[PDB]
Design a protein around this ligand. Structure first.
Ligand SMILES: CCNC(=O)c1cc2c(-c3cc(OCCN(CC)CC)c(Cl)cc3Cl)nc(N)nc2s1
Length: 261
């Protein structure tokens, strides 16, 4: 059941209308905003770890992880930053609702200005709706349990405890359920370009999960047993009609993490 106020639904509908009509040709900028949010959250927990190192108890990693799921049409930006308690999340939503950021952006757009301040105005998250019709946020902060915040393009949201528990240990995962028009964002070449572009001044490692293909010649009888290997996402054995051939070219596809900065 939706938990938005009419004020939240109005403010966010205005933000979305302005952001969309102002950035319809630069849809890709959502990634700059999400990476920016993630670095800010990582800086918060990094700063606290200087006085009390025990804050990193649940997860020593301090990084950003980008991964696409081509079958489910989902893009995820995950970080091991501070994360949010239910209190931090509802405060953040109340901040968005009470502020008149849409007044500032309406003014910027009417004046012929750009959306380069959406990040400084703390509304950069809503740029995700340029490419997605549904955004599912999973978050975990040391002081609370893991929560799920599920938002839609109609400015409606719902918050509930994660049935699977603290799968994140510490940090936040932004899962974008992409629109049919945003398929290009699941490709390794596009993501690599976008991440190299938007990582310029990010003091934390950014990792991309991309396809690695392994090719070798194998004896036909073993080529059939290669298919079963669970260490690979998929195994493609070459199809041959000639019973002459005693060997088969085998392509083993699997995704590994590469440091992008
Ligand atoms: C312990 C406190 N932790 C937090 O507050 C965290 C937030 C976030 C956000 C994040 C930040 C957002 O807005 C930034 C501006 N707000 C706060 C000034 C005012 C609305 C939004 Cl609209 C959405 C998300 Cl998901 N993103 C990420 N990856 N991590 C965190 S950890």
């Amino acid at each position: 059941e939706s938990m938005e106020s009419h004020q939240y639904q109005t403010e966010v509908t205005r933000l979305m209308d302005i952001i969309v009509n102002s950035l319809y040709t630069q849809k890709e900028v959502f990634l700059r905003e999400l990476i920016s949010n993630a670095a800010d959250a990582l800086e918060k927990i990094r700063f606290l770890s200087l006085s009390d190192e025990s804050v990193l108890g649940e997860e020593k990693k301090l990084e950003i992880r980008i991964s696409a799921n081509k079958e489910k049409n989902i893009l995820s930006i995950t970080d091991t930053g501070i994360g949010m308690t239910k209190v931090d999340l509802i405060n953040n939503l109340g901040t968005i609702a009470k502020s008149g950021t849409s007044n500032f952006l309406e003014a910027i757009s009417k004046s012929g200005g750009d959306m380069s301040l959406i990040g400084q105005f703390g509304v950069g998250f809503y740029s995700a709706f340029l490419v997605a019709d549904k955004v599912i946020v999973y978050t975990k902060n040391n002081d609370d349990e893991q929560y799920i915040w599920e938002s839609t393009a109609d400015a409606k949201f719902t918050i509930y405890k994660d049935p699977r528990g603290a799968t994140l240990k510490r940090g936040t995962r932004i899962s974008l359920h992409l629109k049919e028009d945003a398929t290009n964002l699941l490709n390794d070449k596009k993501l690599m370009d976008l991440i190299s572009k938007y990582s310029q001044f990010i003091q934390f490692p950014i990792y991309l999960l991309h396809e690695n293909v392994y090719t070798e010649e194998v004896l036909a009888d073993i080529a059939k047993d290669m298919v079963n290997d669970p260490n690979y996402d998929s195994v493609k054995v070459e199809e041959t009609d000639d019973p002459n051939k005693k060997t088969r070219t085998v392509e083993k596809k699997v995704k590994k993490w590469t440091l992008m900065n």
